[PDB]
């Protein structure tokens, strides 16, 4: 089984941020098999590293996953993961922005916004004002 360090940053503009997150995970843990990283949101369910990991846990390749701090793994659904790891011989370890929340918030509105334009809902107008302000 394996010990995996999982690190993520929101933006490719944060690539510098990501390595430091890796060094930090590396300094805290000196017996780790594998490193996994992604650039993107914890919303993105297509994230390559994250997927390879999720299957690795399911494949039982993983004893432990270490996250530099919370919500590195996903934005929503940690409960599901906790369960998935809890029945897969797996411990989830956490050592410890607004913008990342805020950005994550905007996307959700936009994502919900497609559905609202699809329903021709009167609410679509309200979501659009909300978002533009949020980016304001």
How far apart (Å, rounded) are the C-alpha atoms in residues 136 and 118?
A: 25
Encode burial over 69-89: b for 16+ CB neighbours within 10 A, e otherwise. eebbbbbeeeeebeeebeebe
What tokens does 133 get? 């302000």
- Please report, as residue ranges, which positions from 30 to 89 form the binding site for a second copy (by CB under 8 A): 43, 45-46, 51, 54-55, 58-59, 74-81, 83-84, 87-88
Active-site residue identified among 10, 11, 12, 107: 10
- When asked if residue 123 is in the footprint of a second copy (CB under 8 A), the reply is yes
Collect all residues with Cβ–Cβ distance below 8 Å to 1 and sequence separation of at least 6: 60, 61, 62, 63, 89
Residues 95-114 touching a second copy, rule: CB under 8 A, are 98, 101-102, 104-105, 108-109, 112
Binding site for a second copy (CB under 8 A): 43, 45-46, 51, 54-55, 58-59, 74-81, 83-84, 87-88, 98, 101-102, 104-105, 108-109, 112, 115-116, 119, 121-123, 126-127, 129-130, 133-134, 136
Catalytic residues: 10
């Amino acid at each position: 089984r394996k010990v995996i360090l999982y690190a993520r940053v929101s933006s490719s503009t944060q690539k510098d941020d990501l390595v430091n997150q890796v060094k930090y995970l590396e300094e805290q843990v000196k017996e780790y098999d594998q490193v996994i990283t992604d650039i993107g949101s914890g919303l993105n369910m297509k994230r390559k590293g994250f997927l390879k990991l999720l299957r690795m846990i399911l494949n039982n390749e993983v004893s432990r996953v270490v996250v530099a701090y919370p919500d590195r793994l996903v934005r929503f659904g940690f409960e599901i993961l906790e369960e998935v790891c809890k029945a897969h011989g797996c411990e989830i370890v956490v050592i410890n922005k607004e913008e990342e929340l805020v950005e994550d918030l905007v996307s959700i509105l936009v994502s919900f916004s497609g559905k609202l334009y699809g329903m021709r809902s009167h609410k679509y107008e309200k979501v659009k004002k909300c978002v533009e302000e949020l980016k304001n």
